[PDB]
Amino acid sequence: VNSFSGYLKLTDNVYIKNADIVEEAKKVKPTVVVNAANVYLKHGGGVAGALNKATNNAMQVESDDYIATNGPLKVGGSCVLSGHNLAKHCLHVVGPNVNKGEDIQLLKSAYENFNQHEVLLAPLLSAGIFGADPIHSLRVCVDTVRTNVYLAVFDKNLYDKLVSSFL
Ligand SMILES: C[C@](CC(=O)O)(NC(=O)c1ncnc2[nH]ccc12)c1ccccc1
Known about the structure:
It catalyses: Thiol-dependent hydrolysis of ester, thioester, amide, peptide and isopeptide bonds formed by the C-terminal Gly of ubiquitin (a 76-residue protein attached to proteins as an intracellular targeting signal). The protein is α/β, with parallel strands linked by helices. It has a single domain (8-163), classed as 3-Layer(aba) Sandwich (Leucine Aminopeptidase, subunit E, domain 1). It is 35% helix and 19% strand. It binds ligand A1CJ4.
């Protein structure tokens, strides 16, 4: 039993809520929060910009040191860094950005990173500015992640569409 509240169960291991992931993280303080990162860990907008803002830019400072040491992530890859005030750990995961011509098939590889963690609070990957269809992303999530994932969907209209169209 854990501290997540008000989620709709989609499958044995996938749950979904219309919520701001930043507010969910501040309330729950989960072991792992997922960031929807780019390969440079430049946390400008969306989930990444909002999470970083809530850490008072400490996420960006840590991330710049990580990149200076290790170079960029792969599209489809991830790294584990601190969760700062929001969680024990942040799993920075890079979904493909279809607006940059990146292969949508890498979305499955991105979600595979979640399987290294027993429980995660996460957004839909490759949605929003990454260009991809959120309905497809939820489907890939459900068909790929085996560990327990609590999805926070920011847009109410999208949340309603995802639930009403889920199969
Ligand atoms: C717009 C969308 C999808 C949606 O969930 O509608 N979501 C978010 O950007 C989001 N989700 C959850 N909590 C959040 N806090 C602040 C922002 C935010 C999204 C954009 C880019 C990459 C992944 C997902």
